[PDB]
Each structure stands twice: as structure tokens, then as C-alpha cells.
Amino acid sequence: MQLNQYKLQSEIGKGAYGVVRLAYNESEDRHYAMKVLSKKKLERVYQEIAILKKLDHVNVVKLIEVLDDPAEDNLYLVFDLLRKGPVMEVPCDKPFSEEQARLYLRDVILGLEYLHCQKIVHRDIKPSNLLLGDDGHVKIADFGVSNQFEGNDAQLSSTAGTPAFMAPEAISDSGQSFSGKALDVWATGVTLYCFVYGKCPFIDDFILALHRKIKNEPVVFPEEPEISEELKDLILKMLDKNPETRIGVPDIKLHPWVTK
Ligand SMILES: CCS(=O)(=O)Nc1ccc2c(c1)[C@H](/C(=N/c1ccc(CN3CCCCC3)cc1)c1ccccc1)C(=O)N2
């Protein structure tokens, strides 16, 4: 299958959207990752995809181009190919070192800072959505649940993303909207915990039990592997159940663990 300048080759991943496939550009001798969406599965989307194409940061996966036959179902988003794939899948048998987790936390924070400066909240930060670049740095991927906002923050009502990474305020009977940036800090906190432990801080196969744990249980650090008191401090501030006091990106950047 040829799609303009790309030869579509084998599948490398699948989802609710559709698939991701290798796309060979012969005129460049470069492979790409082509995300093939179904329009029936998805007006407003065309505008959101156009915002995503404007994004340019070393810790955000670059959307190269969009191909579309309006008379047909498929929508093709062409991205940079990162052949090392997701940095981690949870749960896993062996986590990263604390030192390695730090380099990846720095990447995510810089990427997130950049997205928030561009008035985007990601809403699905998690290890499997962090692609490992050939330069050793992670790039934030999967913007399917992201939202653009105006002003200083997103104000949100609906829940979206991955249950195990959703902040308490997003799943609580608030009768009130919640701030989108603090959702991304929380999710990054869950992610950070996954980097050093290989498992989420709140785990349950039963969604109501998962929600209860997220809302009601404190973070419990496994006795092994041991981590630094400084990392524990950062994780507890990022997983503060109160979004009003939960640490922000500016302070995360100044945290002693991050700067050490
Ligand atoms: C989950 C991210 S997404 O929403 O699919 N977006 C996205 C954007 C840009 C990308 C990608 C995805 C990938 C991407 N790369 C990737 C995925 C899987 C592997 C490992 N396989 C192992 C089996 C043989 C082929 C290679 C290597 C690279 C990917 C696709 C689907 C799910 C997770 C990761 C890539 O290289 N660039």
C-alpha cells in the first residue's frame, strides 16, 4: 500500500483509534510511524490536529504531516519513528534506577512545561506514552485525550485518560470543574513512581476499588527497592490529593532531587 510518498509496511501497535504502521519514504530513505485513524470511530478534530502540528519540542513527539481523502474513512498522521518504543510498560519485573528515573523525569517536566506554555493539557501522561528517542531522551506522545485551553489553565468536567493515572479531584463527586495542569502533575507523579517501582502506587482490577484507593489511600513506598528520602518527598508532593497545594512544574524544577 502506497499513500502518496509513503510505502506502508508492517504494523507496530494498535488501539481504539486504529493502528500505527511503519511508513517508508523512499524519496528521503527514512521510515516513519503512521498512525491510521478511523473517522467513524472518532469538525473539531481537524482544528485540534492542526494545533498538534504546530508543536515543536525535543521532548514532544513531532507530528510531521496529515494525509486525508475526505471521501474516505482513514486519517493518516505521520510522526517521527522512535524504534526503541515506549520507555516502560507497567507492571514490569525490574524498574529503572533512581538516577535513570531522574533523567526521564527531567524530560517529561520540560516537555510538560512546554505543552502548558502552549496552552495544552495532555491528560494521559504515563510510561507507555513516553517514547524513548535514539538520543536517550523520552518524548511525550498520544495527544488523543489532550485539550487546548485559554488563560492560565484548563477548566475540566469530563474525565479522560487512563484510570490509574487520574487525579483524585477528577474522579471525585466534586459538583465542580478541576484544573487540567494539576492533573498532568499527578499523572507525572504516578509515572515517576512507576519509573522506580515498575508498578502503579494505586492498583486494583476493580475500577471502583481503584477509585477508592486513589481518593482515600496514602502513597505507600515498598520496602524494596529503597529510594532516597528526597525522591519520596517529591513523589508525595506530586501525589498530594489536594490540587490546591500539589506541587507545580516551576517548583518541581527547583526540587532538590530534580536539581541534584
Ligand atoms: C502510544 C503513542 S501513539 O498514540 O500510538 N502515538 C505515536 C506517535 C509517534 C510514534 C509512535 C506512536 C511510535 C511507536 N513506536 C514503536 C512501537 C513498538 C516498537 C517495538 N516493535 C516490536 C515488534 C517489531 C516492531 C517493533 C517500536 C516502536 C508506537 C506505536 C504504537 C504504540 C506505541 C508506540 C513511534 O515510533 N513513533
Side-chain angles (χ1 to χ4, degrees), residues 2 4-6 8-13 15-29 31-39 45 48-50 52-53 55-93 95-175 177-243 245-259:
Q2 190 74 34
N4 199 18
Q5 79 272 41
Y6 304 98
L8 305 212
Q9 304 173 305
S10 53
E11 190 163 316
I12 62 172
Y17 55 87
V19 301
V20 192
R21 293 169 70 173
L22 288 172
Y24 182 53
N25 188 316
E26 177 155 29
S27 61
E28 280 183 313
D29 189 54
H31 294 264
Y32 293 90
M34 191 182 283
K35 196 173 183 175
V36 190
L37 316 177
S38 172
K39 289 161 181 178
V45 172
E48 295 202 71
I49 303 326
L52 296 176
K53 200 175 162 169
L55 299 176
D56 188 56
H57 195 271
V58 295
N59 301 118
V60 181
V61 72
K62 186 79 195 70
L63 175 54
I64 304 303
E65 73 177 318
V66 185
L67 289 173
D68 184 1
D69 181 342
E72 291 187 331
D73 189 54
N74 286 332
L75 195 67
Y76 311 90
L77 306 194
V78 177
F79 300 84
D80 278 327
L81 176 71
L82 278 66
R83 292 180 314 288
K84 287 180 194 303
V87 72
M88 158 186 279
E89 280 142 26
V90 189
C92 55
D93 291 302
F96 301 131
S97 72
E98 190 167 324
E99 293 84 8
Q100 183 65 74
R102 184 188 286 117
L103 306 184
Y104 295 147
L105 175 70
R106 286 172 180 167
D107 291 339
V108 175
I109 264 52
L110 288 173
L112 207 52
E113 177 177 53
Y114 168 79
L115 290 177
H116 290 173
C117 186
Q118 300 297 306
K119 310 292 170 51
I120 300 295
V121 289
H122 186 273
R123 302 200 71 187
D124 206 12
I125 296 302
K126 51 171 186 183
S128 57
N129 279 341
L130 302 174
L131 301 179
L132 181 54
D134 289 335
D135 66 358
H137 299 277
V138 296
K139 301 193 194 298
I140 298 164
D142 200 344
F143 285 76
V145 159
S146 59
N147 293 330
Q148 180 156 24
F149 62 92
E150 296 149 41
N152 303 341
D153 210 329
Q155 289 77 45
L156 308 166
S157 311
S158 57
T159 45
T162 307
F165 299 77
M166 300 201 189
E169 69 274 19
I171 54 166
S172 290
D173 187 13
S174 174
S177 63
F178 46 89
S179 290
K181 290 196 307 202
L183 301 178
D184 285 341
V185 174
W186 176 279
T188 309
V190 177
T191 300
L192 183 53
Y193 187 102
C194 293
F195 289 169
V196 296
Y197 293 122
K199 76 190 198 211
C200 288
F202 315 106
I203 304 167
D204 214 278
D205 293 318
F206 292 83
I207 187 67
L208 292 187
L210 176 58
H211 288 178
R212 175 175 44 76
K213 285 167 177 182
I214 296 159
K215 286 154 63 199
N216 292 353
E217 297 284 356
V219 176
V220 174
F221 298 104
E223 69 176 322
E224 287 169 8
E226 194 143 61
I227 63 166
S228 66
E229 293 305 297
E230 293 76 18
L231 179 54
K232 285 175 165 171
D233 185 75
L234 175 59
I235 290 170
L236 295 179
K237 295 172 173 165
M238 293 176 80
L239 302 185
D240 182 349
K241 295 194 196 303
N242 186 357
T245 51
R246 183 181 306 151
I247 190 171
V249 178
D251 290 326
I252 291 162
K253 291 182 71 160
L254 306 174
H255 194 281
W257 191 77
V258 170
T259 60

